[PDB]
Scaffold this active site. Structure first.
Site, PDB file in Angstrom:
ATOM      1  N   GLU A   1       4.748  -3.542   5.105  1.00  0.00           N
ATOM      2  CA  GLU A   1       5.561  -2.330   5.172  1.00  0.00           C
ATOM      3  C   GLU A   1       7.048  -2.695   5.012  1.00  0.00           C
ATOM      4  O   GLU A   1       7.480  -3.089   3.904  1.00  0.00           O
ATOM      5  CB  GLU A   1       5.215  -1.530   6.460  1.00  0.00           C
ATOM      6  CG  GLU A   1       3.701  -1.345   6.568  1.00  0.00           C
ATOM      7  CD  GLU A   1       3.229  -0.464   7.710  1.00  0.00           C
ATOM      8  OE1 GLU A   1       3.990  -0.253   8.705  1.00  0.00           O
ATOM      9  OE2 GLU A   1       2.080   0.045   7.601  1.00  0.00           O
TER      10      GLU A   1
HETATM   11  C1  HEC Z   1      10.108   3.864   9.955  1.00  0.00           C
HETATM   12  C2  HEC Z   1      10.477   3.114  11.062  1.00  0.00           C
HETATM   13  C3  HEC Z   1       8.817   4.512  10.171  1.00  0.00           C
HETATM   14  C4  HEC Z   1       8.456   5.459  11.100  1.00  0.00           C
HETATM   15  C5  HEC Z   1       9.307   6.159  12.140  1.00  0.00           C
HETATM   16  C6  HEC Z   1       7.058   5.674  10.939  1.00  0.00           C
HETATM   17  N1  HEC Z   1       6.708   4.939   9.940  1.00  0.00           N
HETATM   18 FE1  HEC Z   1       4.542   4.706   9.303  1.00  0.00          FE
HETATM   19  N2  HEC Z   1       2.712   4.472   8.786  1.00  0.00           N
HETATM   20  C7  HEC Z   1       2.246   3.863   7.674  1.00  0.00           C
HETATM   21  C8  HEC Z   1       0.766   3.695   7.697  1.00  0.00           C
HETATM   22  C9  HEC Z   1      -0.155   3.115   6.620  1.00  0.00           C
HETATM   23  C10 HEC Z   1       0.386   4.188   8.894  1.00  0.00           C
HETATM   24  C11 HEC Z   1      -1.041   4.232   9.438  1.00  0.00           C
HETATM   25  C12 HEC Z   1      -1.238   2.836  10.042  1.00  0.00           C
HETATM   26  C13 HEC Z   1      -2.377   2.678  11.019  1.00  0.00           C
HETATM   27  O1  HEC Z   1      -2.885   3.689  11.613  1.00  0.00           O
HETATM   28  O2  HEC Z   1      -2.845   1.526  11.303  1.00  0.00           O
HETATM   29  C14 HEC Z   1       1.641   4.614   9.573  1.00  0.00           C
HETATM   30  C15 HEC Z   1       1.570   5.236  10.809  1.00  0.00           C
HETATM   31  C16 HEC Z   1       2.709   5.847  11.340  1.00  0.00           C
HETATM   32  C17 HEC Z   1       2.724   6.731  12.455  1.00  0.00           C
HETATM   33  C18 HEC Z   1       1.511   7.174  13.264  1.00  0.00           C
HETATM   34  C19 HEC Z   1       1.208   8.673  13.058  1.00  0.00           C
HETATM   35  C20 HEC Z   1      -0.194   9.059  13.521  1.00  0.00           C
HETATM   36  O3  HEC Z   1      -0.529  10.309  13.515  1.00  0.00           O
HETATM   37  O4  HEC Z   1      -1.042   8.159  13.883  1.00  0.00           O
HETATM   38  C21 HEC Z   1       4.013   7.097  12.667  1.00  0.00           C
HETATM   39  C22 HEC Z   1       4.529   7.987  13.769  1.00  0.00           C
HETATM   40  C23 HEC Z   1       4.830   6.474  11.695  1.00  0.00           C
HETATM   41  N3  HEC Z   1       3.987   5.771  10.857  1.00  0.00           N
HETATM   42  C24 HEC Z   1       6.208   6.574  11.626  1.00  0.00           C
HETATM   43  C25 HEC Z   1       2.987   3.472   6.550  1.00  0.00           C
HETATM   44  C26 HEC Z   1       4.339   3.211   6.661  1.00  0.00           C
HETATM   45  C27 HEC Z   1       5.163   2.617   5.646  1.00  0.00           C
HETATM   46  C28 HEC Z   1       4.618   2.185   4.323  1.00  0.00           C
HETATM   47  C29 HEC Z   1       4.938   1.050   3.684  1.00  0.00           C
HETATM   48  C30 HEC Z   1       6.459   2.570   6.153  1.00  0.00           C
HETATM   49  C31 HEC Z   1       7.748   2.039   5.498  1.00  0.00           C
HETATM   50  C32 HEC Z   1       6.430   3.118   7.459  1.00  0.00           C
HETATM   51  N4  HEC Z   1       5.150   3.566   7.682  1.00  0.00           N
HETATM   52  C33 HEC Z   1       7.531   3.251   8.330  1.00  0.00           C
HETATM   53  C34 HEC Z   1       7.613   4.135   9.433  1.00  0.00           C
END
Ligand code: HEC
Ligand code: HEC
Ligand code: HEC
Ligand code: HEC
Ligand SMILES: [Ca+2]
Ligand SMILES: [Ca+2]
Lengths: 324, 324
Positions: free
Chosen positions: A114
């Site tokens: 990420e």
């Molecule tokens: C920048 C700091 C952020 C913030 C505030 C959040 N994200 Fe992500 N996110 C990504 C993926 C694939 C997931 C699922 C991962 C898993 O379940 O194992 C997530 C999950 C979240 C959540 C959870 C929401 C829920 O309903 O469960 C939240 C609140 C969240 N993110 C906020 C993917 C990415 C990225 C892709 C490369 C990046 C960049 C971020 N997330 C960054 C952030």
């Protein structure tokens, strides 16, 4: 009436006002700082990925990809779930491994696929951007050194707390307006109830309330359910947790395709049929699945209208981006 | 006074009102559509890269990297210049190869190391998103098929035309307020003039007005000036064009680091000294370079306050992202 009342018994409308986080009071300054951080790609090592990249406020708080792509163009194992209303979920991530939004936020910042950043690098970077320290002081006053990985996570959480989608047509319906959803949408609601879907997708967030096997009645197969992702088993090491995931919130589900933690099912309608078969051992008919989608469409709320922050510029001491 | 008046003779403040494009009238609808397209990552094949990725409205209309990274995490040969005020440049790109913003916009959409998309794929995608065709009709009425690669470029151009940065302290100065810049900034202005810099960075945009060798007096070296990038020579095949690039607009130059088409000089101050040596055969002193930076800092204008669009959702017929 019969069905409006049954519904009022199991679900609640999203409140207009952001929820209160414990040990994390909102204030215009703290909310504002978290908005800035949410859209600042300097939270990633490469200076190119922000939270908004994979949770695009323009596209339902998601990235509309099967699985997210981040640093180095690397794909992750999971579909990116929406940040919208995520505040009302009981824990964060598909496997509930983070207890709240502040704990969640530290994850993407450090994850290699990420943002691929480290806390010391992020803090050095933020302190080297002259406009940030004053903003951390307004947000976290009476702290000698407010610029910390913990305060980033705190600022972000109170910003996310504002990212709620009230006034979906279904919430208007739950508030006593029968006309707020169509006849067909009401029949889809009645199917959703009768078929057992609310067992796991109920309450204020239509989901987000507990953990269930993905495959209560049938294995959904090795595409929709990759055999390597055992969900909550990797967090608890408990056999009983194998292939258990948190039920998602179905709010805004019509605009957050594709579906499931694997992101392999693009059509909400296919998602409905797969839920019927996998969770309840039924073959939901085409007509029936169409009525349930129509219902699920009324769960789309007013999308937040978010000003893109004007971010404070680097100084010459700002750490260099890292792309490799 | 002497120097205020000299300045008024060579430069103009950015106008409050967006310029009028020929064969492209603005209208709230056309401007609004171009804003949506600017922030829509579905203009790229991967559905992950928007114009905002490499021209971030939050970070001076740029990406703060040496050279932009796009599809497949591939780096391009050039630093991403700001979209802010770009409308007032005489042609677009470092080598002026596009005559205006509408012609420019087609470039990143098709470039393999940027959005890596093709026109037919982009048009198919836009027509498959149910909220887009109505917006193209409001923007381009009386056209049987308004959703075309040409209209994307047109919508985007009138949006970019609004991305101007008026009311920099120097523009207040040019408008007769001596107190609008500091004593030191005024001495930096006087050095900028006397040393010959306005020969190539003058007019409404402080630059953007013509083509000059990068190295009038000394070769800046193979790092700052990669020997493979011969600038306008690759566009015209004329020997006299070798290592000739457009002079950039110095507006907002303090927040658009790093510098030059190669993006190899991170410190504006080093950029000043390199200009002295490379373009004018002089060694500008440290004190002097500091005064010129101070002047160059007053060229930062009011940054546009841009609402992040709420984009219309895919339908089930929307083409799939392409990441490879
Ligand atoms: C920048 C700091 C952020 C913030 C505030 C959040 N994200 Fe992500 N996110 C990504 C993926 C694939 C997931 C699922 C991962 C898993 O379940 O194992 C997530 C999950 C979240 C959540 C959870 C929401 C829920 O309903 O469960 C939240 C609140 C969240 N993110 C906020 C993917 C990415 C990225 C892709 C490369 C990046 C960049 C971020 N997330 C960054 C952030
Ligand atoms: C009754 C027929 C329904 C309907 C219409 C839906 N559900 Fe569920 N659901 C459950 C869990 C744990 C998940 C996540 C599974 C995973 O991806 O690993 C889901 C997922 C969905 C979706 C997709 C939403 C998304 O954001 O991806 C949809 C549209 C959906 N559900 C609708 C849990 C359960 C149950 C617990 C045992 C039951 C019963 C249902 N779901 C039933 C239904
Ligand atoms: C989405 C369609 C857009 C829009 C509207 C623009 N961009 Fe880019 N851009 C990038 C790089 C490296 C350059 C310099 C390339 C060169 O000179 O050869 C550009 C240039 C521009 C300009 C010209 C501005 C000027 O003053 O000369 C404009 C107006 C412009 N862009 C707008 C980098 C990228 C990307 C990185 C991967 C992406 C994506 C885009 N640009 C997309 C778009
Ligand atoms: C007098 C000492 C100055 C000062 C303070 C600056 N300039 Fe120039 N400039 C010219 C050209 C063609 C370029 C682009 C060269 C390239 O990258 O290939 C530049 C670039 C700059 C910058 C960097 C701005 C950026 O966005 O990257 C700066 C800060 C700058 N200049 C300041 C052309 C000329 C001239 C024509 C012959 C002359 C004379 C100067 N510049 C002189 C000066
Ligand atoms: Ca999804
Ligand atoms: Ca630059």
């Amino acid at each position: 009436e019969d069905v409006m009342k049954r519904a009022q018994g199991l679900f609640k409308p999203i409140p207009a006002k952001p929820p209160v986080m414990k040990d994390n009071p909102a204030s215009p300054s703290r909310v504002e700082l978290g908005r800035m951080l949410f859209f600042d790609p300097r939270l990633s090592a490469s200076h190119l990925i922000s939270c908004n990249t994979c949770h695009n406020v323009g596209l339902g708080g998601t990235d509309i990809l099967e699985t997210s792509i981040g640093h180095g163009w690397q794909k992750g194992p999971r579909n990116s779930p929406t940040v919208l209303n995520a505040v009302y979920n009981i824990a964060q991530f598909w496997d509930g491994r983070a207890e709240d939004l502040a704990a969640q936020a530290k994850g993407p910042v450090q994850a290699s696929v990420e943002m691929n950043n480290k806390p010391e690098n992020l803090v050095a970077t933020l302190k080297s951007i002259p406009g940030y320290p004053p903003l951390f002081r307004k947000a976290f006053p009476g702290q000698g050194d407010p610029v910390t990985f913990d305060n980033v996570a705190k600022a972000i959480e109170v910003f996310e707390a504002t990212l709620v989608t009230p006034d979906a047509p279904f919430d208007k319906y739950l508030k006593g307006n029968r006309k707020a959803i169509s006849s067909t949408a009401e029949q889809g609601l009645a199917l959703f109830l009768d078929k057992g879907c609310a067992a796991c997708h109920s309450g204020v967030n239509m989901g987000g309330t507990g953990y269930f096997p993905f495959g209560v009645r049938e294995d959904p197969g090795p595409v929709v359910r990759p055999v390597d992702d055992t969900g909550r088993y990797k967090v608890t090491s408990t056999a009983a947790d194998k292939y258990v995931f948190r039920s998602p919130s179905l709010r805004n589900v019509a605009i957050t395709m594709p579906y499931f933690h694997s992101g392999k099912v693009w059509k909400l309608k296919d998602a409905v049929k797969i839920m019927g078969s996998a969770q309840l051992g039924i073959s939901i008919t085409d007509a029936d699945a169409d009525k349930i989608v129509t219902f699920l469409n009324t769960l789309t709320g007013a999308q937040p209208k978010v000003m893109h922050p004007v971010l404070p510029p680097n100084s010459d001491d700002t750490p260099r981006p890292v792309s490799n």
